[model samples]
Target: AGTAKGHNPTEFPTIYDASSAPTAANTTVGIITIGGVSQTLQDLQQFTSANGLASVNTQTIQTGSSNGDYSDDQQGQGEWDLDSQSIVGSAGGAVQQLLFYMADQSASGNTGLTQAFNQAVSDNVAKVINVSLGWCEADANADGTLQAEDRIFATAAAQGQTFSVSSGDEGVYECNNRGYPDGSTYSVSWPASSPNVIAVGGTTLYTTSAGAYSNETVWNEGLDSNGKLWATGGGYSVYESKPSWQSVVSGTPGRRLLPDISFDAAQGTGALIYNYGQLQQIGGTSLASPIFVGLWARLQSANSNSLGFPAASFYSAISSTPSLVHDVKSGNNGYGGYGYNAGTGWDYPTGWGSLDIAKLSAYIRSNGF
Candidate 1:
């Protein structure tokens, strides 16, 4: 486990306070992360209490993979398992219903992903969904003429469901997994690149010994010993038009821009999670997406479960009440002299940066979302 004080949930708090946290009595949050969670973990069982979540649902889907195999790579079942735990650990105290949509490991491809979105929207139980997965934007949507898979996401938005997808962990060169930047064409991850969903980026968070929010920068760690890049994925979309909410925002190609928002997602400044019967420190854009899901669910709960998608409101808040966010004005996410830099305002790496949850919640209370 991470021995650093920030690793503990209580140490680096901003919006999530156990004693005074918001209550999500009638809201549901969904998670789509292929391999399922081990419910035996004590960390997850806490949601069975009278004051805890009303229910925890684990739904499974098969995406027609004859091999039926799991990812042997680093981004496999283990990492996905931790991702689920981190979501509950971050937002368990608030949300009432938690849904885990676990697709067959062997079928964890585009088919499964599309089915997952289908399940979430058809079920219509979870208003907020967390998708800590992504694919090459260019490859997935080559022609970018509203592919069938994207229809589900668009339907999700039309149905008032919010999908928070991970921007990616591969930096600007999303398709190149060589870790270091290879001076390749700049690319962002898909699903996140979808204007309908919220693209969640990451940050290197800093907090006081008491767990109070201190500061954060663009999450840009260099390559690990295995030559894996450790940076937040960001950049403009090769396709997809800019949503109306982005009209007020400047600096873009009039195409969809990614990482609509950000959260703490550095392995060094990671959150503590229980997986495989042990506590571990984990971080990635995967973690960042769920953190947003959990926090946004709390916001939905506070507003009578009527706060629909936050994309437009996020921009409104940024333009009207800048203090509602931390506004990370330092660091860069480009690797090896490539990628974008974190700037004074909305940038590619961390758009609108991180949120001041308490202030945002209060603002919602005063002027209905």
Candidate 2:
């Protein structure tokens, strides 16, 4: 349903490029992984401290299930590596340090995620955190409260920590593919839907022959390799109320809207990552979330780590200078005409669209972010 294009990994942030991408020396980024990274990779010389701030002086919390992709883990080592590479790569130089909180969802469920959040708060070191995972609202919690997750997120936000999460790769049908009539349900991913976090959506990125920032569209690949509809997840949240900051957005239905921002996430136009001693191309909201995480870390580092919980500031900044972000006005995230379409302003699919990082950082500095 879409054409695949080539993208140079080193030339990334192309469409997403920064005027002077900051080397995050003062900003510490926490990357939470569901499955742990392999010990072999950890012990390897490639992960040495002299490699710069991101890898050097890294701190890891190893709890729950052990071992990497070599075990029974579903989302294992490979994901951890890919996400870390995206963050560090986009960030340019080393960050102050990287904190990796590795856990297994299969063994501990949402509790595992909670533990990571609690640890981040307790440590009080990391300012920006990246979460590239999600679950449907219905299946995510027992009640509408989302007590454990939302509480921790609000705590983190109040403490000046920002969570950048992947909206989802399932378009609007966030739950598992069960089929039509009975299985055809419209929904959005939780955590991403949570009010305290920034949900990053997906877009199909295109580049010039020289790998310069060209153009993009909503990432909607009709059927993925797994035989499922692949696209950015966005819609109204069933549990959360709209936050006051969202007043700047148009066409909101009062309920909390998902995917405050978006990034390039098309498998056809994937990022090149070196994982498990081999190079491979991959994409999804998984890659998108980390890219924002790395880029946001850059902004924080550039400004002496002064920014905190960017959602409110983001809306405030964009309200006056709409050009701070590239407003994607084409395409839709619906599969079989069941989801929302993209427009001139904020829409469910791409939100305010992707960022122009350098300009956004400048706005933040001037606007007291």
Worst lDDT run of 10 residues, candidate 2, spans: 43-52
For candidate 2, give the lDDT: 0.75
Local accuracy of candidate 1 as per-residue lDDT tens digits, 215-257: 8788888788877677888888877888888877875788888
Q: Write the per-residue lDDT of candidate 2 for residues 221-326, one digit (tens) a residue.
A: 8875656778888887987889999988866678789789998898888776655555567888998898888788888888888787888888887767898887
- Work out how many backbone clashes candidate 2 has: 2
Best by TM-score: 2
Root-mean-square deviation (CA) per prediction: 3.9, 3.6
Error of 2 at 54 (Å): 8.8
**Residue 98 lDDT, candidate 2, scale 0-100:** 80
TM-score of 2: 0.89
